[PDB]
Amino acid sequence: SSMCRAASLLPGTWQVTMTNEDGQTSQGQMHFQPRSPYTLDVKAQGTISDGRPISGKGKVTCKTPDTMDVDITYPSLGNMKVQGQLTLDSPTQFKFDGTTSDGSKLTGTLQRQE
Incomplete structure (x- = not known):
């Protein structure tokens, strides 16, 4: 129950695969928990270059019935x-399309993980 369909379908865990402009890829999980009928909290978990786990937290906000705005901060990566x-x-x-604080153009896919 939310004010946009995407926010109604987002809660839970998603297997996320990301690609930047230079062809580098990454993978991990994204967890969405309801915060308000217009927003959810997002937690991103992943692993960098064969070892160190890295996490970030933020919020997603209803943009259109099927689109949300995405704002995540990664303190363990220089608060990027x-x-x-x-x-x-x-x-x-x-589907995800966005940018990093450094200027990397990113695209990604979120696949529902039961």
Whole structure:
């Protein structure tokens, strides 16, 4: 129950795969918990270059019925930010297009993890 369909379908865990402009990729998990009928809290978990786990936290906000605004901060990575947009493709898949605080153009896929 939320004020936009994407926020209604987002709660839970998603397997996330990311690609930047230079072809580098990454993978991890993103967890969404309801914060308000317009917003959810997002927690991103991942691993860098064969070892150190890295996490970030932020919020996603209703943008359109099927799109959300994305604002995440990664304190363990110099407090760098990831801003973007989540697009509802199916109840089991979201699409991400955004940027980092350094200027990296990122695209990603969120696959529903039960």
